[PDB]
Structure 1
Amino acid sequence: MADVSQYHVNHLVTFCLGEEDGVHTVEDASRKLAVMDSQGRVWAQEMLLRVSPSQVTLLDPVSKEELESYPLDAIVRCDAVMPRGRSRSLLLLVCQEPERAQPDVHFFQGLLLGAELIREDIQGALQNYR
């Protein structure tokens, strides 16, 4: 428990989810992440992920300026997963931003704190908010 916590993570990829792309489960999403990675579309970018009781914020690790923010009302799902062929956990966040026609899948690689700890924190903040 902490109202505001931060974690350093590496953002790996954000991609839109359409009703006809065949991507329906966390597992389908991890598989599309591995395809993307084999096409040279995934490049790790270090970021600061901040969970507060009203939103999840992403910041530049040095400048501390806000790169993106998702109010908790915009998060539709948060999971942590270890795809086949990886010793690590990925943090998956699906958001439906109000202005966008489709939801997006965001994948993050956790560093020392893993994705499981961040998943519990966001899910605790979601339960609370909701």
Structure 2
Amino acid sequence: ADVSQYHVNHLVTFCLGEEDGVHTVEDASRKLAVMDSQGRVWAQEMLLRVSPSQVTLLDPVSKEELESYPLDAIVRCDAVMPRGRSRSLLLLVCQEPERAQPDVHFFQGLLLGAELIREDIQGALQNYR
């Protein structure tokens, strides 16, 4: 029942519209690959904080919240390894209240890794449920 924080690299955030073609995890990974080839992916260092009530994204430097997700807004969290890469990516799917559509977020887990963060967030999701 704690607060933890990890340094991750945010790769991309995109919406799941009703007409995009992103239906599976593999489609989400594919889109990241295409955006990368379009020069639309720039690894941004970020602090990812997991607490009993929310997951927060913060600026490592400023230290100010950039985004905050109550746990009930989180749809799923997975450690995913897309074909082509070798280090798992952290996949987070969320639905902010204020938003019409849910979003997909990909982060590189770095040294501690995507699986550990996924487990921490999943544990937080269960205890909240």
TM-score interval, normalised by the smaller of the two chains: over 0.9
1:1-29 residue CA offsets vs partner (Å, 9 max, x unmatched): x6111100000000000122221111110
Q: Residues 58-110 of structure 1, C-alpha deviation per residue, up to 9 Å, x if partnerless?
A: 11112211111011011011111111111111101110111111101011011
Q: Distance in 1 between matches of 2:127 and 2:26?
A: 27
State the partner residue of 1:36. 35
Give the TM-score of the pair, scaled to structure 1: 0.95
In the aligned structure 2, how far is the partner of 1:66 from the partner of 1:117? 22
1:98 aligns to what SS in structure 2?
coil
1:102 corresponds to: 101
- Residue aligned with 1:30, SS: helix
User: What percentage of aligned pairs have identical amino acids?
Assistant: 100
C-alpha separation between the residues in 2 aligned to 1:87 and 1:4? 29
Q: Which runs of 5+ in 1 are unaligned?
A: none
Secondary structure of the residue aligned to 1:102 is coil
Superimposed CA distance per residue, residues 107-130 of structure 1 (whole angstroms, 9 cap, x where no aligned partner): 101110110100000010001111
Mark the runs of 5 or more structure 2 residues left unpaired by the alignment.
none
Cα RMSD after superposing both structures: 0.9
* More moved, 32-41 vs 15-24: 15-24
TM-score (normalizing by structure 2) = 0.96
SS in 2 for 1:46: strand
